[PDB]
Amino acid sequence: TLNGGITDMLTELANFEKNVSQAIHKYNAYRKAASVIAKYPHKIKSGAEAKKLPGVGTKIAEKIDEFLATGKLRKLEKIRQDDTSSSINFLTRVSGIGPSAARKFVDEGIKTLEDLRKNEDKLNHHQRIGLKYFGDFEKRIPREEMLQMQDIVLNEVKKVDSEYIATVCGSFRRGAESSGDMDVLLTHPSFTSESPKLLHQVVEQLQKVHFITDTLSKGETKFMGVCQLPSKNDEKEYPHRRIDIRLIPKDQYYCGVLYFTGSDIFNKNMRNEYTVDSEKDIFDYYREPKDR
DNA sequence: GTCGG
DNA sequence: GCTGATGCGC
DNA sequence: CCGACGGCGCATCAGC
Ligand SMILES: Nc1ccn([C@@H]2CS[C@H](COP(=O)(O)OP(=O)(O)OP(=O)(O)O)O2)c(=O)n1
Ligand SMILES: *P(=O)(O)OC[C@@H]1O[C@H](n2ccc(N)nc2=O)CS1
Ligand SMILES: [Cl-]
Ligand code: NA
Ligand code: NA
Ligand code: NA
Ligand code: NA
Ligand code: NA
Ligand code: NA
């Protein structure tokens, strides 16, 4: 948190590059600079000090210098105040609204959530769901709720066919105290690298018990949607949550599990998601999810 | 925007 | 209607 | 100096 001013500034610039400029490589450059500075154990005093870090070059060093002198960046102040650029950047916070859709909406005078609400006919299915749960989607999920969600998923999965194997992956599997979403990996002995309706049946059951509430996409191997825990008589509704379910062939299942458990950095220096009869087999060259 | 061949 | 391209999320 | 900078499932578009 020592350089939060700088990292905040670089993330804001990254967002403008991705959402407004449509310059994905600059978005990534700014994000990489932000992340190396975030983990730097000193409070940065000059652009020159920052440049020493991989991913910080001449232009970001110059911006760091301006920020340290003035607590702001003229360029960033100007883009913030720009009605068009700030509106485009904002609308991409809606799931399903990317840089192209945001630009098209803003060019039509649709600039706010309110405007989106009045214009349901101009939104596709995903965007309508993104708008409906805009606030809920930006919330994190407490571990306590993830456990309750896990409970429902594993119960209903076994109920459909006791031969399914399902594992909730992500930071949750590593024992984290909160998650952004629920990631479920599903397999079945019948499904292998060369092999009916295995995903649909699970999705249908989870809908039957009113756990899955909406669908963003559903193909033969991947479901993306929305779920919600049940409430009671006089306790406030749980937020709606993002849930993904991936059907993976049995012989590739445990590579997927390794992958989708992470962490990202752990995967990187353990280094694909596809190609084994357990997590231990791959470890070869064993660490449990807690210490990954 | 940064890096490196 | 078909097929390959594009947008999007992650 | 100048090209690399990620891959893939699904929804939907754009070109015939
Ligand atoms: N951007 C990323 C993030 C994760 N990973 C890999 C594959 S999924 C595995 C575990 O991801 P985590 O759940 O720790 O990261 P998330 O960003 O989903 O944290 P949550 O907000 O907890 O959900 O790490 C990646 O390759 N690229
Ligand atoms: P989500 O943020 O839940 O991430 C989980 C998995 O990580 C992989 N991933 C994340 C981000 C990006 N940009 N690319 C990517 O492959 C797949 S989903
Ligand atoms: Cl770019
Ligand atoms: Na551009
Ligand atoms: Na550097
Ligand atoms: Na979006
Ligand atoms: Na977004
Ligand atoms: Na996640
Ligand atoms: Na597909």
Tab-separated table of C-alpha atoms (C1' of nucleotides) and ligand atoms in Angstrom:
chain	number	residue	atom	x	y	z
A	1	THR	CA	0.000	0.000	0.000
A	2	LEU	CA	3.146	2.189	0.104
A	3	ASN	CA	2.718	3.490	-3.476
A	4	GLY	CA	-1.078	3.350	-3.816
A	5	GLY	CA	-1.245	6.826	-5.359
A	6	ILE	CA	1.007	5.667	-8.211
A	7	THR	CA	-0.595	2.232	-8.650
A	8	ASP	CA	-4.077	3.810	-8.634
A	9	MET	CA	-2.934	6.279	-11.326
A	10	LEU	CA	-1.443	3.507	-13.516
A	11	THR	CA	-4.552	1.310	-13.191
A	12	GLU	CA	-6.774	4.238	-14.171
A	13	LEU	CA	-4.555	4.849	-17.237
A	14	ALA	CA	-4.628	1.131	-18.035
A	15	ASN	CA	-8.417	1.233	-18.002
A	16	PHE	CA	-8.558	4.207	-20.353
A	17	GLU	CA	-6.192	2.457	-22.784
A	18	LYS	CA	-8.314	-0.718	-22.797
A	19	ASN	CA	-11.784	0.843	-22.759
A	20	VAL	CA	-11.391	4.136	-24.694
A	21	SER	CA	-8.199	3.966	-26.790
A	22	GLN	CA	-8.712	0.254	-27.529
A	23	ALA	CA	-4.961	-0.238	-27.080
A	24	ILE	CA	-4.763	-3.605	-25.326
A	25	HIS	CA	-0.955	-3.778	-25.322
A	26	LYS	CA	-0.740	-0.428	-23.531
A	27	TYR	CA	-3.406	-1.605	-21.042
A	28	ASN	CA	-1.185	-4.556	-20.297
A	29	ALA	CA	1.955	-2.409	-20.072
A	30	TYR	CA	0.293	-0.157	-17.473
A	31	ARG	CA	-1.063	-3.164	-15.514
A	32	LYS	CA	2.356	-4.811	-15.430
A	33	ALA	CA	3.933	-1.552	-14.207
A	34	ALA	CA	1.191	-1.212	-11.571
A	35	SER	CA	1.732	-4.777	-10.308
A	36	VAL	CA	5.568	-4.579	-10.026
A	37	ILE	CA	5.269	-1.257	-8.179
A	38	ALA	CA	2.558	-2.678	-5.876
A	39	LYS	CA	4.951	-5.429	-4.664
A	40	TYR	CA	7.897	-3.013	-4.293
A	41	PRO	CA	8.712	-2.830	-0.521
A	42	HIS	CA	9.735	0.872	-0.508
A	43	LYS	CA	7.963	4.170	-0.949
A	44	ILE	CA	9.001	5.503	-4.367
A	45	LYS	CA	10.689	8.924	-4.316
A	46	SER	CA	11.539	9.406	-8.010
A	47	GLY	CA	10.803	8.246	-11.551
A	48	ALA	CA	14.410	7.007	-11.779
A	49	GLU	CA	13.919	4.644	-8.818
A	50	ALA	CA	10.810	3.149	-10.489
A	51	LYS	CA	12.498	2.683	-13.912
A	52	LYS	CA	14.837	0.125	-12.364
A	53	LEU	CA	11.852	-2.180	-12.129
A	54	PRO	CA	10.981	-4.436	-15.070
A	55	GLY	CA	7.941	-3.007	-16.870
A	56	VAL	CA	8.611	0.592	-15.861
A	57	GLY	CA	10.120	2.538	-18.763
A	58	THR	CA	10.740	6.174	-19.700
A	59	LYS	CA	7.165	7.408	-20.038
A	60	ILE	CA	5.842	5.899	-16.766
A	61	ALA	CA	8.921	7.278	-14.943
A	62	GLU	CA	7.988	10.725	-16.312
A	63	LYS	CA	4.400	10.262	-15.096
A	64	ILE	CA	5.659	9.138	-11.689
A	65	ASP	CA	7.761	12.332	-11.508
A	66	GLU	CA	4.750	14.548	-12.363
A	67	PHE	CA	2.586	12.715	-9.795
A	68	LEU	CA	5.169	13.122	-7.025
A	69	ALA	CA	5.488	16.841	-7.778
A	70	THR	CA	1.786	17.675	-8.038
A	71	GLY	CA	-0.281	14.734	-6.725
A	72	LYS	CA	-1.902	14.508	-10.165
A	73	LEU	CA	-1.367	13.934	-13.871
A	74	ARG	CA	-2.551	16.664	-16.251
A	75	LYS	CA	-3.418	14.029	-18.882
A	76	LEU	CA	-5.394	11.889	-16.466
A	77	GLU	CA	-7.281	14.909	-15.033
A	78	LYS	CA	-8.256	15.886	-18.547
A	79	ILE	CA	-9.488	12.441	-19.564
A	80	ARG	CA	-11.444	12.085	-16.270
A	81	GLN	CA	-13.305	15.323	-17.045
A	82	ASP	CA	-13.954	14.270	-20.660
A	83	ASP	CA	-17.661	13.426	-20.909
A	84	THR	CA	-17.214	11.009	-23.808
A	85	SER	CA	-14.122	9.180	-22.548
A	86	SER	CA	-15.318	8.871	-18.929
A	87	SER	CA	-18.752	7.575	-20.044
A	88	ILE	CA	-17.241	4.953	-22.363
A	89	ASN	CA	-14.880	3.837	-19.613
A	90	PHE	CA	-17.740	3.620	-17.100
A	91	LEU	CA	-20.185	1.566	-19.267
A	92	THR	CA	-17.585	-1.223	-19.728
A	93	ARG	CA	-18.149	-2.037	-16.019
A	94	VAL	CA	-21.371	-3.687	-17.201
A	95	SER	CA	-20.764	-7.367	-17.936
A	96	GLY	CA	-21.264	-7.833	-21.711
A	97	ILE	CA	-20.475	-4.211	-22.511
A	98	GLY	CA	-16.923	-4.131	-23.863
A	99	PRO	CA	-15.068	-1.233	-25.551
A	100	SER	CA	-16.962	-1.594	-28.850
A	101	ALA	CA	-20.486	-1.622	-27.305
A	102	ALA	CA	-19.610	1.182	-24.887
A	103	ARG	CA	-18.438	3.412	-27.751
A	104	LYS	CA	-21.564	2.663	-29.750
A	105	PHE	CA	-23.842	3.452	-26.750
A	106	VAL	CA	-22.062	6.710	-25.899
A	107	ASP	CA	-22.171	7.834	-29.554
A	108	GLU	CA	-25.971	7.385	-29.299
A	109	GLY	CA	-26.235	9.478	-26.121
A	110	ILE	CA	-26.514	6.443	-23.812
A	111	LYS	CA	-23.996	7.287	-21.097
A	112	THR	CA	-25.250	6.114	-17.691
A	113	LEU	CA	-26.870	3.047	-16.083
A	114	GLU	CA	-30.092	5.065	-16.141
A	115	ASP	CA	-29.780	5.439	-19.928
A	116	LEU	CA	-29.155	1.695	-20.274
A	117	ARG	CA	-32.268	0.969	-18.207
A	118	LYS	CA	-34.410	3.064	-20.592
A	119	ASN	CA	-32.939	1.263	-23.586
A	120	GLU	CA	-33.456	-2.494	-22.930
A	121	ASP	CA	-34.195	-3.089	-26.649
A	122	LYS	CA	-30.642	-2.035	-27.600
A	123	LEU	CA	-29.017	-4.552	-25.201
A	124	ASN	CA	-28.309	-8.217	-25.906
A	125	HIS	CA	-29.106	-11.000	-23.371
A	126	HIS	CA	-25.754	-10.873	-21.587
A	127	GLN	CA	-25.849	-7.085	-21.308
A	128	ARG	CA	-29.380	-7.154	-19.858
A	129	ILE	CA	-28.195	-9.560	-17.148
A	130	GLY	CA	-25.019	-7.486	-16.588
A	131	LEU	CA	-27.195	-4.393	-16.077
A	132	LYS	CA	-29.725	-6.167	-13.819
A	133	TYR	CA	-26.976	-7.331	-11.423
A	134	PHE	CA	-24.510	-4.475	-11.943
A	135	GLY	CA	-24.128	-3.882	-8.200
A	136	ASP	CA	-24.245	-7.545	-7.149
A	137	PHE	CA	-21.530	-8.479	-9.677
A	138	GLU	CA	-19.048	-5.995	-8.180
A	139	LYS	CA	-19.416	-7.552	-4.700
A	140	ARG	CA	-17.035	-10.221	-3.408
A	141	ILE	CA	-18.322	-13.470	-1.916
A	142	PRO	CA	-17.550	-14.256	1.756
A	143	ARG	CA	-15.990	-17.715	2.401
A	144	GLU	CA	-19.007	-18.623	4.567
A	145	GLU	CA	-21.353	-18.134	1.579
A	146	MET	CA	-19.000	-19.985	-0.797
A	147	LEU	CA	-19.174	-23.003	1.540
A	148	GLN	CA	-22.986	-22.888	1.427
A	149	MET	CA	-22.844	-22.573	-2.369
A	150	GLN	CA	-20.390	-25.482	-2.531
A	151	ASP	CA	-22.783	-27.534	-0.352
A	152	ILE	CA	-25.641	-27.005	-2.823
A	153	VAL	CA	-23.549	-27.682	-5.946
A	154	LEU	CA	-21.922	-30.924	-4.714
A	155	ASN	CA	-25.266	-32.180	-3.343
A	156	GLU	CA	-27.226	-31.576	-6.557
A	157	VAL	CA	-24.401	-32.882	-8.753
A	158	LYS	CA	-24.254	-36.215	-6.863
A	159	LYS	CA	-28.093	-36.286	-6.957
A	160	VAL	CA	-28.120	-36.232	-10.795
A	161	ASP	CA	-25.492	-38.967	-11.097
A	162	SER	CA	-23.287	-40.199	-8.242
A	163	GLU	CA	-20.473	-40.869	-10.711
A	164	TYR	CA	-19.926	-37.165	-11.469
A	165	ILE	CA	-16.896	-35.613	-9.877
A	166	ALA	CA	-17.131	-31.892	-9.096
A	167	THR	CA	-14.532	-29.590	-7.556
A	168	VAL	CA	-14.935	-25.916	-6.711
A	169	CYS	CA	-11.601	-24.405	-7.705
A	170	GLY	CA	-10.199	-20.845	-7.638
A	171	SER	CA	-8.852	-19.045	-4.577
A	172	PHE	CA	-11.652	-20.743	-2.594
A	173	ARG	CA	-9.897	-24.098	-3.000
A	174	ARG	CA	-6.684	-22.560	-1.626
A	175	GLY	CA	-8.625	-21.492	1.476
A	176	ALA	CA	-9.013	-17.759	0.727
A	177	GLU	CA	-11.482	-15.732	2.824
A	178	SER	CA	-13.348	-14.317	-0.205
A	179	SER	CA	-13.880	-15.003	-3.929
A	180	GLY	CA	-15.036	-12.994	-6.962
A	181	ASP	CA	-17.016	-15.860	-8.489
A	182	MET	CA	-17.624	-19.609	-8.197
A	183	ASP	CA	-15.700	-21.873	-10.596
A	184	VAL	CA	-16.934	-25.460	-10.767
A	185	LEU	CA	-15.021	-28.158	-12.621
A	186	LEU	CA	-17.093	-31.194	-13.559
A	187	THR	CA	-16.153	-34.610	-14.954
A	188	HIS	CA	-17.626	-38.092	-15.482
A	189	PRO	CA	-15.978	-41.441	-16.301
A	190	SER	CA	-17.935	-41.652	-19.583
A	191	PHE	CA	-16.362	-38.372	-20.814
A	192	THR	CA	-12.767	-38.785	-22.000
A	193	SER	CA	-10.426	-37.361	-24.695
A	194	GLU	CA	-12.638	-39.251	-27.168
A	195	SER	CA	-16.308	-39.574	-26.156
A	196	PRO	CA	-24.281	-37.323	-23.604
A	197	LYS	CA	-25.760	-34.047	-22.194
A	198	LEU	CA	-23.522	-34.302	-19.101
A	199	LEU	CA	-23.365	-30.544	-18.550
A	200	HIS	CA	-27.053	-29.859	-19.363
A	201	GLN	CA	-28.371	-32.328	-16.780
A	202	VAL	CA	-26.379	-30.638	-13.968
A	203	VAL	CA	-27.372	-27.143	-15.069
A	204	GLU	CA	-31.017	-28.243	-15.251
A	205	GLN	CA	-30.969	-29.686	-11.693
A	206	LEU	CA	-29.354	-26.530	-10.283
A	207	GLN	CA	-32.126	-24.562	-11.975
A	208	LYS	CA	-34.779	-26.963	-10.694
A	209	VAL	CA	-33.756	-26.197	-7.091
A	210	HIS	CA	-33.687	-22.457	-7.891
A	211	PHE	CA	-29.959	-22.099	-7.285
A	212	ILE	CA	-29.111	-20.986	-10.855
A	213	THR	CA	-31.256	-17.952	-11.707
A	214	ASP	CA	-29.978	-16.784	-15.136
A	215	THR	CA	-27.851	-18.016	-18.030
A	216	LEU	CA	-25.180	-15.907	-19.809
A	217	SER	CA	-23.995	-18.737	-22.062
A	218	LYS	CA	-24.241	-22.526	-22.288
A	219	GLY	CA	-22.550	-24.875	-24.710
A	220	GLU	CA	-21.560	-28.536	-24.507
A	221	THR	CA	-18.545	-27.938	-22.219
A	222	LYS	CA	-19.036	-24.551	-20.551
A	223	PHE	CA	-21.883	-22.852	-18.677
A	224	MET	CA	-21.717	-19.263	-17.445
A	225	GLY	CA	-24.505	-17.812	-15.381
A	226	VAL	CA	-25.871	-16.417	-12.179
A	227	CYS	CA	-26.837	-18.093	-8.941
A	228	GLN	CA	-28.218	-17.143	-5.560
A	229	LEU	CA	-28.371	-18.746	-2.114
A	230	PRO	CA	-31.856	-19.093	-0.600
A	231	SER	CA	-32.827	-16.660	2.157
A	232	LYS	CA	-35.622	-17.038	4.735
A	233	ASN	CA	-38.621	-15.172	6.243
A	234	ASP	CA	-36.985	-12.003	7.592
A	235	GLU	CA	-33.327	-12.054	6.555
A	236	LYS	CA	-32.147	-9.874	3.652
A	237	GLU	CA	-31.600	-11.457	0.218
A	238	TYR	CA	-28.131	-12.699	-0.665
A	239	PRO	CA	-26.600	-10.945	-3.690
A	240	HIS	CA	-26.709	-12.745	-7.043
A	241	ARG	CA	-23.345	-14.320	-7.892
A	242	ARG	CA	-21.425	-15.300	-10.989
A	243	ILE	CA	-21.027	-19.051	-11.449
A	244	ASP	CA	-19.083	-20.894	-14.149
A	245	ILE	CA	-19.310	-24.660	-14.719
A	246	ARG	CA	-16.806	-26.428	-16.991
A	247	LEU	CA	-17.166	-30.023	-18.159
A	248	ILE	CA	-13.718	-31.520	-18.698
A	249	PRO	CA	-12.819	-35.019	-20.009
A	250	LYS	CA	-11.888	-37.416	-17.175
A	251	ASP	CA	-8.316	-37.943	-18.401
A	252	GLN	CA	-7.777	-34.156	-18.477
A	253	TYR	CA	-9.738	-33.366	-15.309
A	254	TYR	CA	-6.879	-33.156	-12.825
A	255	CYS	CA	-4.747	-30.879	-15.039
A	256	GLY	CA	-7.768	-28.563	-15.212
A	257	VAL	CA	-8.125	-28.706	-11.421
A	258	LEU	CA	-4.429	-27.844	-10.956
A	259	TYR	CA	-4.823	-24.968	-13.416
A	260	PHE	CA	-8.068	-23.446	-12.123
A	261	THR	CA	-6.934	-23.668	-8.508
A	262	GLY	CA	-3.793	-21.626	-9.219
A	263	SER	CA	-2.665	-19.293	-7.914
A	264	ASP	CA	-1.724	-17.453	-11.128
A	265	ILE	CA	1.879	-16.921	-9.946
A	266	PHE	CA	2.124	-20.558	-8.746
A	267	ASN	CA	1.016	-21.868	-12.158
A	268	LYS	CA	3.598	-19.589	-13.811
A	269	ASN	CA	6.654	-21.020	-12.030
A	270	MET	CA	5.253	-24.554	-11.996
A	271	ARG	CA	5.538	-23.785	-15.720
A	272	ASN	CA	-1.225	-26.324	-20.239
A	273	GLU	CA	-4.622	-26.558	-18.486
A	274	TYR	CA	-5.389	-29.756	-20.446
A	275	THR	CA	-2.392	-32.151	-20.225
A	276	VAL	CA	-2.662	-38.131	-14.912
A	277	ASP	CA	-5.029	-39.588	-12.289
A	278	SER	CA	-4.624	-36.920	-9.584
A	279	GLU	CA	-2.958	-33.566	-8.824
A	280	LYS	CA	0.024	-35.411	-7.320
A	281	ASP	CA	0.870	-37.226	-10.600
A	282	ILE	CA	1.567	-33.896	-12.351
A	283	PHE	CA	3.713	-32.537	-9.496
A	284	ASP	CA	6.444	-34.947	-10.605
A	285	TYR	CA	9.674	-32.887	-10.833
A	286	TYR	CA	3.364	-32.410	-3.627
A	287	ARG	CA	1.950	-29.102	-2.375
A	288	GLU	CA	-1.653	-28.826	-1.143
A	289	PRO	CA	-3.930	-25.926	-2.320
A	290	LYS	CA	-3.370	-24.058	0.996
A	291	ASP	CA	0.371	-23.623	0.240
A	292	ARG	CA	0.094	-22.734	-3.477
B	1	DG	C1'	4.244	1.552	-23.298
B	2	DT	C1'	8.066	-1.632	-22.609
B	3	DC	C1'	11.083	-4.754	-24.005
B	4	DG	C1'	14.596	-7.080	-26.624
B	5	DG	C1'	16.336	-9.242	-30.992
C	1	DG	C1'	-28.990	-20.611	-44.606
C	2	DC	C1'	-23.769	-21.411	-44.216
C	3	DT	C1'	-19.211	-20.087	-42.722
C	4	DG	C1'	-15.631	-17.488	-40.869
C	5	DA	C1'	-14.924	-13.116	-38.255
C	6	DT	C1'	-15.538	-10.425	-34.226
C	7	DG	C1'	-16.864	-9.134	-29.382
C	8	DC	C1'	-16.625	-10.497	-24.955
C	9	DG	C1'	-15.269	-12.549	-20.514
C	10	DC	C1'	-11.803	-14.542	-18.000
D	1	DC	C1'	14.741	0.515	-35.149
D	2	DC	C1'	10.516	-2.214	-35.164
D	3	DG	C1'	7.555	-6.464	-34.055
D	4	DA	C1'	5.666	-8.945	-29.942
D	5	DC	C1'	2.762	-8.417	-26.490
D	6	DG	C1'	-2.370	-15.270	-25.162
D	7	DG	C1'	-5.843	-18.677	-25.803
D	8	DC	C1'	-10.412	-20.260	-26.134
D	9	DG	C1'	-15.818	-21.150	-25.535
D	10	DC	C1'	-19.861	-19.123	-26.784
D	11	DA	C1'	-22.990	-15.491	-28.771
D	12	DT	C1'	-23.651	-12.854	-32.394
D	13	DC	C1'	-22.327	-10.432	-36.501
D	14	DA	C1'	-20.950	-9.756	-41.414
D	15	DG	C1'	-20.245	-11.467	-45.920
D	16	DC	C1'	-21.900	-14.406	-49.398
E	1	LIG	N1	-6.026	-13.619	-14.497
E	1	LIG	C1	-5.833	-14.895	-14.083
E	1	LIG	C2	-6.311	-15.313	-12.838
E	1	LIG	C3	-6.092	-16.630	-12.438
E	1	LIG	N2	-5.443	-17.486	-13.254
E	1	LIG	C4	-5.193	-18.881	-12.863
E	1	LIG	C5	-6.215	-19.809	-13.507
E	1	LIG	S1	-7.559	-19.871	-12.382
E	1	LIG	C6	-6.335	-19.923	-11.109
E	1	LIG	C7	-6.936	-19.507	-9.770
E	1	LIG	O1	-7.416	-18.169	-9.875
E	1	LIG	P1	-7.839	-17.312	-8.581
E	1	LIG	O2	-9.245	-17.697	-8.175
E	1	LIG	O3	-6.720	-17.374	-7.563
E	1	LIG	O4	-7.833	-15.834	-9.224
E	1	LIG	P2	-9.138	-14.906	-9.373
E	1	LIG	O5	-8.652	-13.684	-10.120
E	1	LIG	O6	-10.309	-15.709	-9.917
E	1	LIG	O7	-9.449	-14.495	-7.837
E	1	LIG	P3	-10.933	-14.424	-7.184
E	1	LIG	O8	-11.268	-12.951	-7.216
E	1	LIG	O9	-10.713	-14.956	-5.785
E	1	LIG	O10	-11.795	-15.292	-8.088
E	1	LIG	O11	-5.287	-19.021	-11.451
E	1	LIG	C8	-4.972	-17.042	-14.516
E	1	LIG	O12	-4.311	-17.895	-15.354
E	1	LIG	N3	-5.182	-15.762	-14.895
E	2	LIG	P1	-11.426	-15.110	-13.641
E	2	LIG	O1	-10.987	-13.693	-13.346
E	2	LIG	O2	-12.319	-15.812	-12.647
E	2	LIG	O3	-10.099	-16.012	-13.859
E	2	LIG	C1	-10.146	-17.435	-13.759
E	2	LIG	C2	-9.536	-18.133	-14.975
E	2	LIG	O4	-8.253	-17.578	-15.302
E	2	LIG	C3	-8.009	-17.647	-16.712
E	2	LIG	N1	-7.856	-16.297	-17.279
E	2	LIG	C4	-8.223	-15.140	-16.442
E	2	LIG	C5	-8.030	-13.858	-17.106
E	2	LIG	C6	-7.554	-13.786	-18.403
E	2	LIG	N2	-7.400	-12.574	-18.971
E	2	LIG	N3	-7.252	-14.906	-19.094
E	2	LIG	C7	-7.395	-16.135	-18.538
E	2	LIG	O5	-7.069	-17.221	-19.291
E	2	LIG	C8	-9.201	-18.327	-17.379
E	2	LIG	S1	-10.613	-18.010	-16.377
E	3	CL	CL	-2.025	-1.534	-27.897
E	4	NA	NA	-7.024	3.337	-30.766
E	5	NA	NA	12.239	-0.898	-16.218
E	6	NA	NA	-17.920	-5.035	-19.511
E	7	NA	NA	-15.467	-4.485	-17.585
E	8	NA	NA	-12.540	-15.918	-10.117
E	9	NA	NA	-18.464	-23.716	-28.660
